[PDB]
Amino acid sequence: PLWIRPDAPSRCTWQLGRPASESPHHHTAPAKSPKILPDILKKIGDTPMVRINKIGKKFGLKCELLAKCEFFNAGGSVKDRISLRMIEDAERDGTLKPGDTIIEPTSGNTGIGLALAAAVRGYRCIIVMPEKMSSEKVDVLRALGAEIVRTPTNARFDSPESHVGVAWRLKNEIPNSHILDQYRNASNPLAHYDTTADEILQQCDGKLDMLVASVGTGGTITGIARKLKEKCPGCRIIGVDPEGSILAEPEELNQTEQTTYEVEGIGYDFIPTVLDRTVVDKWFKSNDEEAFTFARMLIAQEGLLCGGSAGSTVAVAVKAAQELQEGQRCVVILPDSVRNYMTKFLSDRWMLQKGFLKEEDTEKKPWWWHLRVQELGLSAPLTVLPTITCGHTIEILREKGFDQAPVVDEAGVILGMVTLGNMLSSLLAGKVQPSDQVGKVIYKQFKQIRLTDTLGRLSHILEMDHFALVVHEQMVFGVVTAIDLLNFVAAQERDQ
Amino acid sequence: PLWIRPDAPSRCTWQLGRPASESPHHHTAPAKSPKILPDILKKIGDTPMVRINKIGKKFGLKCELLAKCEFFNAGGSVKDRISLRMIEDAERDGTLKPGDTIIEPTSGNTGIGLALAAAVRGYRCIIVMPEKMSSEKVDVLRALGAEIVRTPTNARFDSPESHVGVAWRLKNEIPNSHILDQYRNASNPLAHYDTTADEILQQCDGKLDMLVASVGTGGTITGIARKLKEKCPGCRIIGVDPEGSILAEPEELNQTEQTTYEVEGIGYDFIPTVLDRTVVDKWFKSNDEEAFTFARMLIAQEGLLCGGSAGSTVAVAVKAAQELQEGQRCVVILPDSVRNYMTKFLSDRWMLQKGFLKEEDLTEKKPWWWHLRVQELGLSAPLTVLPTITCGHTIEILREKGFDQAPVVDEAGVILGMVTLGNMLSSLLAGKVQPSDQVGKVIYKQFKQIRLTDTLGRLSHILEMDHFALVVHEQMVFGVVTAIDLLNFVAAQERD
Ligand code: HEM
Ligand code: HEM
Ligand SMILES: *Cc1c(COP(=O)(O)O)cnc(C)c1O
Ligand SMILES: *Cc1c(COP(=O)(O)O)cnc(C)c1O
C-alpha cells in the first residue's frame, strides 16, 4: 500500500524557546552571489522589499506598509525557493540521482520552479495540477520540457483522482521516480526559515510589527513565523485563507456554502503536515472579488505586477493592519506575478463574465463613453477599385482633396485602405512604382462599425486597431481613427 | 508645422578619445539601493549576468558565454531603464510638470515602462504602438491605466499613419502634453551609458572580448558601445538587425524581398538619431525562425524566460563568437520576458501556423508511441449510470460490479460527466453529501471526447488539458482513459 497522507500530523518536536542548536535539520544560510551566476537558479532569492504608498493611505492605514515582492524570482513565484531547496536537499541525501524522474502535485508555481530546475539540471519533470489552474502555466511548463497531467478540481484529496493521488500512482508506475512532496517535505518551510525570514529581518533591520501571508501549503508562513517568533517575537502573524478552505481558525470561520473559488495557489481541503497553525496569531478569510479587485488595484496604483494571491493578501492587510499606529510597519507577502494570470483577472471580459464586475461600475468612464458614432458627424469617403494603380491613386486623392481611400471591390468586399502620405512615401522611397498594384501599399487590417455604435466600443477597437469603418449589413459610411475621436472630444472641451 | 524627424542626423559632438569631462549632458552614476525601496521604480537596474551553459557548447563556441538578463526589471524589459531616466531628466529640466500628459510611440516595452512610471507618479499615459505587437502588451498596458492607440504596421515613418506621426498629432491635439521621444532623446543612450555598461564592466571586472546586442532604437548598443570603447576598448561590438530592416551595414546586407517580420522590438525603416552606427564593429542579419528557435531553445535549455528579441541576439552570438578561443568571453543582451509573447512563439500551434515549424521535425522529436491508435490500448467498456441515481446506490453498484469509475449518461444519451468510487466515498465520509442525495453534487463535469482512430499523441495533449478522455462513437462510450492508463500501456511495452 503506497500513498502518504499530506494531512498527517507533524512529528516535529520544535517548540517555541528551543535553542536553535537542537535542530536535526540541515540548515544552509543565505550567502553572497558571485558577479557572474553559473546558472539562472542562483537568481532565486534576495527579493526586494517595497513600500506601498497609495493603497495603504487609501484605506486609512496610519502605518508603514511594506511588500516583499517574490515575483522577481527566476520562475516568478515564491515556489522557486522551495523547489530549489527541496531538490538540493534531495541531492545531499543521495535520494535523488541525476537522470531521475521527478513527479510533483502543485498549484503550478512549484511545478514551474521544479520544471525550471529540471530543465537546467537534466532531471525529467512530470507535473500534476488541477484543471482549474490557468493555461499560461501550462504554456510555460510545456516550454520547459515538462510532461503535464491534470486532475479534477472537484476531487477530494482522499480520492484517487486528486493531484496527490494521481501523483503517487504515477510514482508507482514510473521506475526511479521521486516525489519531493512539498506538503510533507521539511525543505519547504525550512527554505522559508533560513532565507526569506532573514531577508525580511535584515530589510527591516529587525524591527517589525505585523506580517500578512496567504497560506497554501503553510510553508511560507510557517518558516517565516517561526524564525520571527524567535528573532522578533513581538510580531503578529496573520494568515489568509480563501473561503471554501478549511485551513483557518477557529473553525467557525470555515462555515460556508461554496466549495470552490477562482484564486489559484491558496487554500486546501486538508491540513498539510508542513503547516504549523499554532504560530498564526489570527486568521482572515478572503474571497475572489476582494482578491482580484485588490490585485488590479495593486497593479494600477502601485505598479506591482503580481498575482491574485497577492491581491488576497493585501486585501486582508488593509483590514488587519487597522489597529496599528504610525511609526509601526506591516509586511505583506506577494507570492507571484501576472504572467500566469494574463487571460484571467487581467482580462476585463473574464472579470465581467465571472461576476466580479458590475457593468454599472459605466461609472468610471468619461462623459463621452456613451454616445453614438453618429454624433461625430464624420464624412463620406471615396472608394477605389483594387485594380487601380499607385500613381492614379495619388492623382485621384489629390484632385479630389482626400487623404485616404478605402479599397473596395465590384463584388463589394472591402479589401483595405490606402493613404496619400504612405503612397507618396513608398513611391518617393522607390518601394513602389506608379504602375504598381495597390495591393503592396494597402493597409489590410481594420474593423467595422455601425452609426448606432457607442464611442466607447470605438475606444476599445482603437486599442486594438487603427481604422474603424462605419458600415451596414456592404457599404462604408465613414472612416475613423483615434485622432478623429480626439478632435471631437477636444472640440467639446472648448464648447463648455 | 510640428513634427520632428526621428531619423534626423545626430548633432552630438562626441568622438572617440574625448575626455568625459567635456560632456554637457547631466550624468547620474549608479548607487546602492536602500533596504526598503520607496517605490517599485527603484527596482529598475542591477540586472544579473548569467553564464549560458548548454547552448554555447552545443554550437561549438570555445568561449564563456554570458547573458545580461534585463527582464528582471520591474516592467520586465530593458526599456524600463530608459523609461525612468527619460522621466527623471525631464523632471530636472522642469519640462515635465506633475499632472501632465505623456505621449509615446513604442514597440511597447518603452510604453510599459512609461505607463508604469506614470501609474506610480500620477502622470497620464498615452501609448501609440503598431498593430503587429502582441496583445499581452496591450493587456498589461490597459491594466496599468494607459490609454492605447494603434497604428498600421506597414505604415512608413514618413507617413501620417506611423506611430511617430500619430504620436505627434496627438501631441498637437492635447494641451500640456509632451513626447519624450526615445528616438531623439539623449536620456535613452545615456541611460545605457551610465548604468548598464558600468554594470557589465563591474560584473566582468572590466575584462571582455565580444558583445552582442540587437538594435531597435540603438540606445542600448550605443550607450554600451561608447562606454565600452572608452573603458574596455578591445571589445568587439556586434549589432543584430532583423531581415527587412535597413539598420545594418554595409547596405548590401539589407537587400531583401520581404518588408515585414514577426520579431517585436527590433529593426526599423529609418535610422534613429540616438543610434551611432559608427561604434558597431559588425552587423548581423537575423530572421524570425532563427529567433524563435533560439528563444525556445533558450527557455528549454537554459531556463531563461525571455523574449524573441533575445532569441535573435543569441542566434547571432553562436555565429559571431566562433572566432573566439577559450579564455575569452562574449556578453549577450537579453531584452524582455515571455510575458509579452505568451500566446505567440511559446504556443506550438502559432509556430506551426506561421511556418516556423515543420510537422516532420515534431514527429521526429516524439517518442515511439506518439503515432498509435487509442484502439491499441485495448481498453474496456465502462458502466454508465443515470443522473437521478443517488450516491449510496452509486457506491453499491460500483462495488457490487467491481468498477472504480462510472460515466454518467442520459436517457437522451448526453454524457454529463464522471463519478468515481473514491470521491463518492470521500465525499460521504467527510459529510459533504448524504447517501440519499443526487449524484450531481459529487459529479466530475470536465472531460474530453476521443475516437478509437485518434492518435496517442493527441491523447497526450488532451491529457495535458484534461483528466478524463472518453473514447466514443457517433450514445456509446468505448472506454475511459487517463494519464495512468496510457502509462500502464507504455510501461508494459517498456517491460517487454
Ligand atoms: C530545535 C528545532 C527543531 C527540532 C529539534 C526538530 C526536530 C524534528 C524531529 C525530531 C522531526 C521528526 C524527524 C522524522 O521523523 O523524520 C522533525 C520533523 C520535521 N520538522 Fe523539525 N525540528 C526543529 C525545527 C523545525 C523548524 C524550524 C521547521 C520548519 C521551519 C521544521 C519543520 C519540520 C518538518 C516539516 C518536519 C517533518 C514532519 C514530518 O515528517 O512528519 N522543524 N523535526
Ligand atoms: C564628451 C562627450 C559629449 C559631448 C561633448 C557631447 C555634446 C553634445 C552636444 C553639443 C549635443 C547637441 C545638443 C543639442 O543641440 O540639443 C549633443 C546631443 C546629443 N548627445 Fe552628446 N555629447 C557627449 C557624449 C554623449 C554620449 C556619451 C552620448 C550617448 C552615448 C550622447 C548622446 C547624445 C544625444 C542623443 C544627443 C542628441 C542628439 C541631437 O539632439 O541631435 N552624447 N551632445
Ligand atoms: C503556493 C502559493 C501560495 C502559498 O504559499 P504557501 O507557502 O504554500 O503558504 C500563494 N500564492 C501562490 C501563487 C502560490 O503558488
Ligand atoms: C527596444 C527593444 C530592443 C532593442 O533595444 P534598443 O535599445 O532600442 O536597441 C530589443 N528587444 C526588445 C523586446 C525591445 O523592446
Curated annotation (Swiss-Prot), chain A:
Changing I238S: In CBSD; loss of activity. Pathway: Amino-acid biosynthesis; L-cysteine biosynthesis; L-cysteine from L-homocysteine and L-serine: step 1/2. There is a cross-link at K171 (Glycyl lysine isopeptide (Lys-Gly) (interchain with G-Cter in SUMO)). GO terms for molecular function: carbon monoxide binding; cystathionine beta-synthase activity; enzyme binding; heme binding; identical protein binding; metal ion binding; modified amino acid binding; nitric oxide binding. Changing T47N: In CBSD; decreased cystathionine beta-synthase activity; increased aggregation. Changing T222M: In CBSD; moderate form. The keyword Phosphoprotein applies. Allosterically activated by S-adenosyl-methionine/AdoMet. Activated by S-adenosylhomocysteine/AdoHcy. Binds non-covalently to a heme group that may control the redox sensitivity of the enzyme. Changing M133V: In CBSD; presents 40% of the wild-type activity; highly reduced capacity to form multimeric quaternary structure. It is an enzyme of class 4 (lyase). Changing A186T: In CBSD; presents 20% of the wild-type activity; dramatically reduced capacity to form multimeric quaternary structure. Its EC number is 4.2.1.22. Keywords: Allosteric enzyme, Amino-acid biosynthesis, CBS domain, Cysteine biosynthesis, Cytoplasm, Disease variant, Heme, Iron, Isopeptide bond, Lyase, Metal-binding, Nucleus, Phosphoprotein, Pyridoxal phosphate, Ubl conjugation. Changing E104K: In CBSD; loss of cystathionine beta-synthase activity; impaired stimulation by AdoMet and AdoHcy; decreased homotetramer formation. It is linked to Cystathionine beta-synthase deficiency: An enzymatic deficiency resulting in altered sulfur metabolism and homocystinuria. The clinical features of untreated homocystinuria due to CBS deficiency include myopia, ectopia lentis, intellectual disability, skeletal anomalies resembling Marfan syndrome, and thromboembolic events. Light skin and hair can also be present. Biochemical features include increased urinary homocystine and methionine. This is Cystathionine beta-synthase. It comes from Homo sapiens (Human). The lineage of its organism: Eukaryota, Metazoa, Chordata, Craniata, Vertebrata. The gene is CBS.
